[PDB]
């Protein structure tokens with residue numbers, strides 16, 4: 274669903290929507306990805322837990338950051354839903370860049386049936402800055418579990434008898450509001466000065 | 474708490490107790506371990522979700538396996554709480570072996586302040602059999618994030634001004650009923666023929 278004119282993101286509908294994402298991690302076809310899935314669900318659960326304390330006070334994602342800034346003083350933004358969403362957005366951003374890169378025909382012509390170059394760009398853009406050396410190594414090792422581009426798209430459809438070309442068009446359509454939403458979240462962190470750069 | 478004479482493990486108290494374990498993963502002192510924590514909590518949450526449907530029907534862990542065998546026929550044991558507990562026990566077992574190995578003075582004399590040999594034995598005994606080649610590599614990479622033995626024990630106390638010797642005695646005491654409980658769980662899977670050996 275698109276953004277309102279005021280670009281405020283409603284927390285309830287947002288959480289409803291993003292809870293559809295973790296299951297997709299089996300479109301990757303390896304148990305290597307199950308811990309990532311659990312990790313992302315954890316951020317969603319935390320934001321949900323905060324939201325459920327006072328859906329009115331926490332009606333928008335902006336409100337979450339505002340109220341928590343006040344509630345936590347010097348520990349903010351490394352606290353609460355503000356912290357879980359700071360990490361969730363980076364996961365969302367990684368997915369966005371990865372998909373877009375694939376949709377844009379970016380590839381290694383030496384190895385066109387893979388998705389390493391797309392995941393690597395996605396990692397560099399969304400996460401690398403916030404991760405130390407050992408996590409970068411674990412990411413680099415994790416990539417050997419990544420499905421073939423073929424299989425990945427196939428899985429985003431299913432046995433669903435549809436072309437690669439069709440699947441990519443649907444992904445392209447999807448990316449429009451997905452990207453716009455994530456850009457509003459990143460903009461909100463920037464303007465509230467809530468972004469932390471610690472390397473984990 | 475010890476086992477009853479009938480060795481039946483009550484589900485409610487078990488879940489209460491094991492929910493204390495995931496937080497310990499920060500005793501390891503690296504965000505490398507956060508996905509593992511989320512993974513283990515996921516198994517606990519799933520068992521809890523099943524238990525909450527009918528605490529009477531699911532009063533013991535044995536009951537879980539029994540009722541699910543019946544409910545799921547040919548998909549059992551790769552289903553439900555039986556599957557989450559099959560994986561939880563392996564995590565519990567890994568922790569047990571790791572601790573015991575440390576308590577038993579097992580070490581690499583070339584590198585005594587580390588815990589690699591203890592984690593490696595723990596991995597070989599609890600998990601290696603169920604994991605493919607890429608996960609074994611990720612485990613092997615993860616170990617470079619492992620704390621020094623010193624720091625690990627220190628963290629199991631805290632600033633808590635207590636000796637290594639003291640901490641290990643408390644761990645030894647802890648391991649008695651911990652181990653006995655886990656042995657009953659493994660025995661139950663064996664006798665119900667509910668163990669799956671698929672390599673993930």
Ligand SMILES: CCCCCCCCCCCCC/C=C/[C@@H](O)[C@H](CO[C@@H]1O[C@H](COS(=O)(=O)O)[C@H](O)[C@H](OS(=O)(=O)O)[C@H]1O)NC(=O)CCCCCCCCCCC
Pocket residue numbers: 308309312315316317319351353356357358360363364367392400408411415416419471473504505506507508509600608611612615
């Ligand atoms: C045999 C078993 C061996 C397995 C051993 C380990 C396996 C490797 C696991 C490590 C992999 C690296 C991934 C690291 C992830 C997390 O450290 C980071 C930070 O996570 C946050 O840490 C936080 C603490 O922050 S800190 O105070 O700054 O430390 C919080 O705990 C926060 O929780 S919450 O309560 O706020 O909601 C939590 O998510 N998470 C991320 O990096 C996001 C990962 C998004 C993944 C995007 C998709 C990747 C796809 C990969 C496929 C190629």
Ligand SMILES: CCCCCCCCCCCCC/C=C/[C@@H](O)[C@H](CO[C@@H]1O[C@H](COS(=O)(=O)O)[C@H](O)[C@H](OS(=O)(=O)O)[C@H]1O)NC(=O)CCCCCCCCCCC
Pocket residue numbers: 304305306307308309400408411412415508509512515516517519551553556557558560563564567592600608611615616619671673
């Ligand atoms: C930048 C971001 C990069 C990060 C990318 C990935 C990082 C690496 C993550 C992979 C690490 C390997 C660990 C793999 C764990 C899991 O695959 C396995 C199986 O997990 C189960 O899979 C299951 C599916 O089973 S299957 O049908 O057979 O596939 C279920 O999904 C089950 O969920 S539940 O719903 O049943 O409750 C789920 O736990 N889990 C384990 O191996 C247990 C791990 C215990 C860890 C013990 C402590 C390790 C400490 C390490 C420190 C040295």
